[PDB]
Ligand binder design. Sequence first.
Ligand code: SF4
Ligand code: SF4
Ligand code: FES
Ligand code: FES
Ligand SMILES: [Fe+2]
Ligand SMILES: [Fe+2]
Lengths: 635, 635
Amino acid sequence: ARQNLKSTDRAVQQMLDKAKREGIQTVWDRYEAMKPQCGFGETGLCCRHCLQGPCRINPFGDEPKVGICGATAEVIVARGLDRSIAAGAAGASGHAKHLAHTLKKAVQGKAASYMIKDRTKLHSIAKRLGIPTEGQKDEDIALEVAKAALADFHEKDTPVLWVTTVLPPSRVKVLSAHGLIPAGIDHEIAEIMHRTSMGCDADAQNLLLGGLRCSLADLAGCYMGTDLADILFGTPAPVVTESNLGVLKADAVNVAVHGHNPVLSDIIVSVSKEMENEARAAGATGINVVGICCTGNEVLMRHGIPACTHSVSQEMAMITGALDAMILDYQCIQPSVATIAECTGTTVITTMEMSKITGATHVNFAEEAAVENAKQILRLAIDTFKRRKGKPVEIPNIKTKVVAGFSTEAIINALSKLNANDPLKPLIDNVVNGNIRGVCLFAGCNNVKVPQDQNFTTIARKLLKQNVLVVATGCGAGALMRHGFMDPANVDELCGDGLKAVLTAIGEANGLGGPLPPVLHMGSCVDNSRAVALVAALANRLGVDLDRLPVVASAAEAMHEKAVAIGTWAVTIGLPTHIGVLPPITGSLPVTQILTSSVKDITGGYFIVELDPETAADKLLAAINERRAGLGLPW
Amino acid sequence: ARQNLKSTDRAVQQMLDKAKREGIQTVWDRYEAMKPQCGFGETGLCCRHCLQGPCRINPFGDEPKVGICGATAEVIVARGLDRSIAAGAAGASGHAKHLAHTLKKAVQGKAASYMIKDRTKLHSIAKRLGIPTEGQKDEDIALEVAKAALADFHEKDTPVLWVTTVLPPSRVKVLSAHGLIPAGIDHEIAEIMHRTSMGCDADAQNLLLGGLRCSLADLAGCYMGTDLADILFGTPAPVVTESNLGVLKADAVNVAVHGHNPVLSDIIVSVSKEMENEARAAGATGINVVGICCTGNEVLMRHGIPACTHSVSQEMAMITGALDAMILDYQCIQPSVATIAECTGTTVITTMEMSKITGATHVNFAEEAAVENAKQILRLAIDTFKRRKGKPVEIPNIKTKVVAGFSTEAIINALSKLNANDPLKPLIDNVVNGNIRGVCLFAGCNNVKVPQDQNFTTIARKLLKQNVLVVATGCGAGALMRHGFMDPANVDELCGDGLKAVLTAIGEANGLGGPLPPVLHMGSCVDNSRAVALVAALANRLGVDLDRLPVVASAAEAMHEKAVAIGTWAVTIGLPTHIGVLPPITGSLPVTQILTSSVKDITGGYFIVELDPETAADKLLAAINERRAGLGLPW
Ligand code: SF4
Ligand code: SF4
Ligand code: FES
Ligand code: FES
Ligand SMILES: [Fe+2]
Ligand SMILES: [Fe+2]
């Protein structure tokens, strides 16, 4: 088998060969067994929203042409897309809500493993929300912030403040004029599910406007999640670590944290240190915590925990034979891990009540008992390490160097070394003079349909040569880090001369004797909100709205409903937004035309659907350069 | 074409012949064009929850056997079912929330077309919720009730009170022990959408427990909707009217109200009276308001507005040529009505922001302007009547007599004429002595897969002969009313001797010189909550939980996600619950076993999946008789 057709990651290729000779079925094998996939679902021309279905519509030819109730292709496609947006927003809702409850418990004395670690961020958030801080105790300010977070989930006398206070007034005004500001996060999710049920909304434009509004509920959940996690766990600052499977160590207890909400896995990191001597008593060198997916990104950004792998290739960490435990919260966890565990000697542990996997051990995490829970979990991992005494393992000796931790605060701080009282100005100066052509945010997942990482790296390489400042989150950051795009030693090879000059100037003013890395890692999927903060700050500093800035986004290998929601809010806030896999819209030309063209007249953003990555890079560069021209800049 | 294979309603058959010769496509034609339907969707073995899909699993044979991410058939089936429950609950959320806002506006002086019409119900609801009434103005009590309603949508220091205050403490205790009490209505909807997204919950039992809890969020929305509509519009009492297409009048302006939330259509009824002389100036005899679907049931129950048709046959009202306007809110409206309108000369009008139909005129209803909006709408209808001057119409001269209005308060009042201070006792006496074998609630829709009404009438006939007290809501009530089951003149033919004796005794004590009708119409789909109130009151009076009572439910021709949610909460509160169409569960035996068998050990209720109505009636009778035996009663 030509494993490079499955993944461009050489460590993944090595583990695919091991899985093949050991007869362990992988995600790629399950994909092959699924082909050919249903074309009605692929194009969006299937509806199961009532028990008269399934209804399907032929993309072309003869009947069926319309759903049983009369729903047109337009309506079916838009309703399906809307439910995907609501599902994505629901995951942001759950993640942010859990942190809000954790912060409230911490300051009420109910969860002493948690605390206010970033008091400055707490006060800034409170100020942004309009909560008084002068003369108030930090615990009372934090209680008010947590109450405000919980209030944004339902209707009240204000709209969702984690939208209206984080975008510039001119953008809020555009959105309000179109009725797009969410009334409440869970309120919008429920309204989507209602309006898309049988015999309700049946006008494509009306449906899609509802979807844009629900996507902003996802944005609010993202921003709230980042805000609360920074209060609780610290705002990221620049870190150096490593990525890929070679970060596993045969002689250590290897523990992966996997999922998205790091609420317990930030605790796992701290407790794992305490238990070093206990792990050594078991014959290990220590506990080696490694990251998978967003939870991995969270602890990478804040603590420099090395990232083992991401998204589509997550099973491969287990195939090494050296993964003693995989500690799960929720989201993006292939449930195959529970069955593979029996073959590989990994202990798979679930921790959240609403995310269990048949066959995996469940340990009831509670903030109130977080240290206790962590010790129970890590002792299972130590037990598992002991059971593999004397078993060879196959860890690919493949890893990259990763500089990360570029929160928006960290980026502004780095720029302030060039201009202390106007830190965005050096960035803008270099956009104006062409040393920085524009900004591209890579976001979202890998997808088994695309050879792993191929779109991210192909597009990033062409943008970097054209002097684009590239920022990344989620498993887009994962793809780029595992291929060396976060190692400053690769700036000469990857970057155009103008971009190299800027990364070098900033790095040398931050005492590095060397440049910033080719790509700036801005964190997890909720931390796409950090990219919003940066872009909104640039818009404010320039006095223009986001749809005039040379800033684009690319969900180059999108998979999860979360990625559909993110792409939709990127469009809603004003960005040209590439998606590199086909969303289920091509069965309706009118819906496609709205999402790729006429939405420009509503929000200024628009989708760019392009599966060929070289072509996508050209289209993204054209979008950037069109924005440059609109600002009167050379390009 | 043998139209009796499509509908057992003879008026519908006549209009199907008219549609055929005029070349107007109907729901039945669109169904035929859809056959054969996809077996993966039919069985539940399809997933589109991420962009790696669609994934499908062969019910039997070879690969594919598992989803791409590892999701098993169990997981796929349970996730799909859970999303359907959440969608149903979301419609109850929207409906109830709109009424809560209407009540709040009314008592704040912001919507003078609305008012407190049932002060006694207001005070009783307040007492049930724990809101003080002594010394308080009605407007302040109502503000507190509306605030409490809105609070049940989100988490707070109490669970959802429209669950915990409406079921007996022993039932609440059972549900709480299993973690099934909702934390908030929209909170549960969002948690379902999260947990069912890719890489989250992947254990069938855990998923289905979440679904049971979300179904109780639907129950809360139903009960809240009924409570608030009774405050605003009056609690139903016994009414006499008519049903079927013969209620249309060629010489009148015929206006159908269609959808579910009657917030404007209760106003349409009152304003239509005011405009009699204006309609007469246009050459009509008056404005003839008629009902379709739940909104029709609402105005039938409160005002005796005749019901034109229901559910699957709704297009046939238009085919007569005499329907001048169809006034829509949301839910259960086939969007085909907008295109048929061009053929039939009907003006189709949408009124709610989140439910538009391409090609239909939209009129922006606002409580604040309700009378103004109603006049605008009715003037469009008058204009349309004038355009059909001199056009023949074909109204089938087919109608039945309907006695309805059996709210739980009305039933208790009727029984109190036999026992003033213990009004449930005469009902219980007759259950004990066998004159009443048990109670069956018919609920939910028609479904194009089932010859219209055939399951409702076949099952009802066999239960009535076996002395079952039959109550009905929604388009189950619609089916039964259109076939004479709400006409007391049919008691001799339909009812067993014991049931006849009871209906006669109650009727003769209420001054009727004649029995109650064979079936008691308890209202719209949210008014399934009234059946809960009756059953909970019987449980309380007997000192037993609902899972010991000889009470069953039947969604005999279910269609909408709403009907899936209702069936699931019927099971959750303890009832044997028949469903007469196949829900998408048969692709997983473990899920089927949970829903039809092992849930008995959790809630005491269970699904009975049976597509053959004679067999379903036997299974429902066996369920009733098993409950009788458990109470020590003869059967
Ligand atoms: S909502 Fe309409 S299109 Fe969808 S399954 Fe039901 S009948 Fe078919
Ligand atoms: S969630 Fe799993 S089963 Fe569903 S479409 Fe995605 S890969 Fe397939
Ligand atoms: S027909 Fe294949 S996704 Fe429904
Ligand atoms: S394969 Fe037909 S419903 Fe998906
Ligand atoms: Fe992610
Ligand atoms: Fe209904």
